[PDB]
Amino acid sequence: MGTVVIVVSRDERILEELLEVVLKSDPNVKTVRTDDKEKVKEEIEKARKQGRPIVIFIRGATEEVVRDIVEYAQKEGLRVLVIMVDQDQEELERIYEQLKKDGVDVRVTDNEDEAKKRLKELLEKVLEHHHHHH
């Protein structure tokens, strides 16, 4: 159908571990790492043309980056699953409250292992495609 997973981490080593999780879960899921928020949108449309899931990886995505990409994926009619993992948690909670307000699937934590567990967890909800958040 088409499904977008927004991964926001401000630490390098988190993005690559979460990429590893997508590859070990399923390689056919489209994976993207551009921190250019417009270039993300280009690859969102491409994934909708492929009619498949896509996992976006951005280093240091501030609130106005994340909300801007999430609402765009919703314009396309795609299901949005958002992981935000970094030690600047209160910052990620302002992103969280903005997206949660809409009813977007969101989660915030700061832990390598937890991030990687909940990464595969989302990918399994997407392949199953039964558990839509709202």
- Token readout for 100 is 């949660």
Q: What angle do CA 28, 32, 37 make, to 5 degrees?
A: 145
- 39 burial via Cβ count (<10 Å: 0-12, 13-18, 19+): exposed
CA–CA separation, 38 and 68 (whole Å)? 9
Count of helix runs (H) and strand runs (E) in the chain: 5, 5
Q: CB–CB of 23/118 below 8 Å?
A: no
Full strand arrangement of the beta sheet holding 3-9: 30-32, 53-59, 3-9, 79-85, 105-109
Instruction: Note the residue count of the chain.
Output: 134
Identify each DSSP E strand in 63-102 by its residue range.
79-85
- CATH T-level assignment (fold) for domain 1-134: Rossmann fold (3.40.50)
Q: How far apart are the first and last CA of the chain?
A: 17
Residues 45, 54 contacting (CB under 8 angstroms): no
Strands (E) located in 51-97: 53-59, 79-85
The method of structure determination was: NMR
Residue 97 CA to chain centroid, in angstroms? 16
